[PDB]
Design a protein around this nucleic acid. Structure first.
Lengths: 96, 94, 78, 107, 97, 78, 107, 93
DNA sequence: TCGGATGTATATATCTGACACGTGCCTGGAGACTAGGGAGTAATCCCCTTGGCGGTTAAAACGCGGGGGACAGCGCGTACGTGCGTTTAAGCGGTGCTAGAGCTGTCTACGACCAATTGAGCGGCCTCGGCACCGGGATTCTCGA
DNA sequence: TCGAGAATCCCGGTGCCGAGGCCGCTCAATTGGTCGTAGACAGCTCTAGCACCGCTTAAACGCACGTACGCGCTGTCCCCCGCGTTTTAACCGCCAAGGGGATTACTCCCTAGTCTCCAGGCACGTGTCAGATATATACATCCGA
């Protein structure tokens, strides 16, 4: 009955995803999300492909930074898991 | 020999316009002057950047309007835009 | 209906890149809300930048500008 | 013939001439439009009127007829939008608004 | 001696009083001496205006009270009432400094 | 030395204004360290500002510039 | 006419003439000194040389003879002064320097 | 559409510091954007210093002060030395 | 614990599209000269910043009794990690169409420049009213039993 | 909950200096005009974004199982707090002085501006090899037997 103990697969994923530099959020759903968000600001707006790529890159970098900060908060609170209070305090300290 | 420049008389005029009788201390006077200077500098810098962004050379009404919509929160931006447009059209009506 | 399109595995992958081992099930709603707020702000700035230029296409240049004006600049796009 | 000031022409109180001179001599751009100083002065006047109305309300709350930096600081922070606009400035004689966390309260 | 205040009540009165007021907390002369000593190693025998030291101390106090505030929030998040140096260093790390 | 100019009661008052009930022991050394580093940065910027203008007295308005450069505006001094 | 480029006159690699043109056209001040573009070109060249040497080292120890944005971000973040300078900068197509907190690691 | 950018100069300085290392197109764009951003930052600081000192020109001193304000310690020292060397050698011609 | 199995680092073939380099051209940089206002330099004053002395008192420093809190240990039941089968739709590659960005020509209204001027705004004085400070005492908390 | 003890809002009275108004003076904003050009507008091109259509397979979904641990609870020990008592140096006031910040004048000379000339850099085109993929092999390592 081969089975990896919890945590090891998480560590492998963490190392593999920190070593890599590719784009994580799927492109098409993010493009649709951006189009919907911009739809209520202007009628029938158009978007350049490079603009959507820049939006995705900036948003992913911001999320990675926020998750790193909230992981710091979690390991500060004597635990290894993150819950919404952690990211809430991280945002509040960051000055959102 | 001194010709220091400040927004004291104008902020006092607007204060007496909104509140019939309320004093402003010297510290509050300097603070309001600094706030006015900071907001003006921010809006002027944003308008300058916006003029440089389309190979244009004129700071016009649209530049400051977009700068106000950029650097101000929602309700504040809407009210400031309405007030500025009203002032501009009143001036041009003369 | 579409904000959900940023699904649970994508959030988990982003968090793993961020450097966190375990993830609770109540964080996906919060991170989707954070995503929506941040994208609303940045896309509003980009949209008003385009509206100033009498354009209908949000160019990448104005988006990166708007990010720079937000206080979080970005390279690789001019 | 006639010396009708431009500030009264626009129906304002802030100096449109002074902001025009500052824009022109502040090397923000090669040339400045005619309506640009009027728009900028109107925006500045509205912001100042809003912040001063809030400060005067706060002062009247504290049974004082003189606006002091404490009243300005309180009026800025209590209102959410002006707090967001001025969220990175540190007002002299600030005295941040009272705030006690729920857990810290005795029980 | 009867009627001794339990810990926390005096602290609560002090925190309410200092939040209500807006006076100067850092003593003027020690801060001025400190800033002169820390600036004498950047340029020899340079002088400081009184308003310069006053503005510097005001910015000092504002930054320090903001930090504390944030570190008190962080300490509360860790199921604690008292701040610890871990809290300030983590708050500084999150703030980017 | 001259870093003990700010004292234990003074830091206690600063923290009480900041909104914290109880205070540890090493907290004073940590706050003195962070205060020293922040004041060193600001004083370096202000001293360079007053050095550029061929002056040997630091006006308050330089200090205002030094604070503004570090992304921390100050009001009531110019 | 000798036709001696000012960039080669100052012994630099960056275009001092183009920097001067950008300084003049860019609304910074009504007049720009002669040595200002030279100083700016020198500063830009030194900063680019430092960052490119670091990125080249990060490429060489990665068994690759071509710099990619990942190598540039690794060079920027690994150094201390550059990280302080480029603090708010987000590098497109770059990743993140690998790190794992001590607590999260297994026993 | 004669778009202009710091394209050949970054490559030249790279080939000067590293003989055979190449730069990818994305790396070229990143380096060009970084050069533009740093130049704009230094020019803005110099302009602020010159205008707010009741001066009207940007000289070597203004940019030296700007680069001492912006860059961190060691980078500021080395950049100041390099700029002074370049200006002196240019004036010597 | 050694050991089976999983994942990952390493060598080799290969084939591809992006990078390095050659070439023509033109627009922007450079050589040279003018002229005009910025500022480097020189005095001069008086503002204020440094320095010092006396007191006086608030606040810092020290020490002790102790109760509330930080922290470690332990139990539990749940929420999340991990893996497998199913379902989904993202990503791939073409293909067509046109809304709209980019470029070009023009001519006109709009903003810079400049002489004259006059009144809005600043420097300085004066005055009284809003506010700081002290004494009384009623209310509002807090603590022990 | 019911007692006394302390801490604070409130009120009245007195003084004080800072804000508000007034005055005179000036310099900068306004009138009016002229003139060069920035861009508003119309016209055109044509790169590029959008919608569709189908195929493939990576990725997300759902579920079952286990177990790591987040959280609650309790015990301990310790360590800041409150408070009383001692000490010290901050602060206020006053007095001297001279460093240099700010100002004005003058002359040098640095740089904007223009004309002319040419070559450095850019758009375009083409070779070619650095590296991305795939297969096979050997090492790191993980979790049990």
């Amino acid at each position: 009955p081969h089975r990896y103990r919890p945590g090891t697969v998480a560590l492998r994923e963490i190392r593999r995803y920190q070593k890599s530099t590719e784009l994580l959020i799927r492109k098409l759903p993010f493009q649709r999300l951006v189009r919907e968000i911009a739809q209520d600001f202007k009628t029938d707006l158009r978007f350049q492909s490079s603009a959507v790529m820049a939006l995705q890159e900036a948003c992913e970098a911001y999320l990675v930074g926020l998750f790193e900060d909230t992981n710091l908060c979690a390991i500060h609170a004597k635990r290894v898991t993150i819950m919404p209070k952690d990211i809430q305090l991280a945002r509040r300290i960051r000055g959102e | 020999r001194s010709r220091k420049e400040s927004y004291s008389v104008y902020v006092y005029k607007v204060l007496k316009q909104v509140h019939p009788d309320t004093g402003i201390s010297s510290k509050a006077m300097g603070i309001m002057n600094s706030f006015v200077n900071d907001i003006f500098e921010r809006i002027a810098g944003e308008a300058s950047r916006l003029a440089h962004y389309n190979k244009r050379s004129t700071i016009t009404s649209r530049e400051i309007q977009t700068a106000v919509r950029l650097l101000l929160p929602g309700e504040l931006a809407k009210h400031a835009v309405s007030e500025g447009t009203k002032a501009v059209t009143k001036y041009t009506s003369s | 209906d579409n904000i959900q399109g940023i699904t649970k595995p994508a959030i988990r992958r982003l968090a793993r890149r961020g450097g966190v081992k375990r993830i609770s099930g109540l964080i996906y709603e919060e991170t989707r809300g954070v995503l929506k707020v941040f994208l609303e702000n940045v896309i509003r700035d980009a949209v008003t930048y385009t509206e100033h230029a009498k354009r209908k296409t949000v160019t990448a240049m104005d988006v990166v500008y708007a990010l720079k004006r937000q206080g979080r600049t970005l390279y690789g796009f001019g | 013939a006639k010396a009708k000031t431009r500030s009264s022409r626009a129906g304002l109180q802030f100096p449109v001439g002074r902001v025009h001179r500052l824009l022109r001599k502040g090397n923000y751009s090669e040339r400045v439009g005619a309506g640009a100083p009027v728009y900028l002065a109107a925006v500045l006047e509205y912001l100042t009127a809003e912040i001063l109305e809030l400060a005067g309300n706060a002062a009247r709350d504290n049974k004082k007829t003189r606006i002091i930096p404490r009243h300005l600081q309180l009026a800025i922070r209590n209102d959410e939008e002006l707090n967001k606009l001025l969220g990175r400035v540190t007002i002299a004689q600030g005295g941040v608004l009272p705030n006690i966390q729920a857990v810290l309260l005795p029980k």
